[PDB]
């Protein structure tokens, strides 16, 4: 079934200005971004965000981090999304992920990896309407 | 000097998923892009934009094009930001594009062209303010 996932392409991988690069590995799996923005996370809106570890002691620093600068939230779009998205993005921690995907080429750590994506239907369908309206979604 | 200067990934680009390698041209150029957001322009909107044509008989199909479907507008900055956009982009008529630039090796047509990008610091102003808050740009 052709699905919508959220991925955030994080303050490390723009600073690094590898947003193409990025972006060209979903589109060339075969997603397509239908929602995209760019922007600087406020420590309220990062917060709320990953409120599930709100009281984990890990929490400011993933906070903190996702702060740091400006990042590009996005919808991918397409067959088995959220999980082919999983696939090209590698394990969360960057030392334990298979060459070839996201985090094995582009990330530093586990705060510094270098994009973010939804683990499952239920989170992506909050995580998408976290930060976007129906209206900023195109799909196509 | 760094300036900043508008660029819009057009209908046709978007639709072939080349977002990212299009992305990429700009940032392996040393370009960086300090706002950006896809969206689906309005009759209005692109109107608005495209302003100083109103009363050409290109108009409509100008307009017409650019909002056949969802298009991303960003902000690209760096050295030579304007200039250097438009070098990247190649000649407006795709077909008299120098190869290597974006429009000889994405474009199909005058209409279809994959990309857009400001011809002048005064008219670099004007669009990026007609897209963007100050907000909305993110400097690094």
Same mark, same amino acid.
């Given at each position: 079934?052709?699905?919508?996932?959220?991925?955030?392409?994080?303050?490390?991988?723009?600073?690094?200005?590898?947003?193409? /690069?990025?972006?060209? $590995?979903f589109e060339?799996?075969?997603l397509?971004?239908?929602?995209?923005?760019?922007?600087?996370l406020?420590q309220?809106?990062?917060?709320?965000? #990953?409120?599930?570890?709100?009281?984990?002691?890990?929490?400011?620093?993933?906070?903190?981090?996702?702060?740091?600068?400006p990042?590009?939230?996005?919808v991918?779009?397409?067959?088995?999304?959220?999980?082919?998205?999983?696939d090209?993005?590698?394990?969360?921690?960057?030392?334990?992920?298979?060459?070839?995907?996201? $985090?094995?080429? #582009?990330?530093?750590?586990?705060?510094?990896n270098?994009?973010?994506?939804s683990?499952?239907?239920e989170?992506?369908?909050?995580?998408i309407? #976290?930060?976007? /309206?129906?209206? /900023?979604?195109?799909?196509?």
């Open positions: 079934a052709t699905e919508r996932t959220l991925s955030i392409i994080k303050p490390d991988a723009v600073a690094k200005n590898v947003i193409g /690069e990025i972006e060209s $590995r060339k799996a075969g397509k971004i239908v929602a995209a923005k760019m922007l600087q406020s309220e809106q990062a917060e709320g965000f #990953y409120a599930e570890h709100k009281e984990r002691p890990f929490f400011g620093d993933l906070v903190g981090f996702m702060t740091s600068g990042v590009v939230v996005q991918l779009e397409g067959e088995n999304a959220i999980a082919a998205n999983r090209l993005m590698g394990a969360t921690n960057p030392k334990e992920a298979e060459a070839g995907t996201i $985090r094995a080429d #582009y990330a530093q750590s586990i705060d510094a270098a994009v973010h994506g683990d499952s239907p989170s992506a369908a909050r995580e309407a #976290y930060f976007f /309206e129906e209206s /900023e979604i195109c799909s196509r």
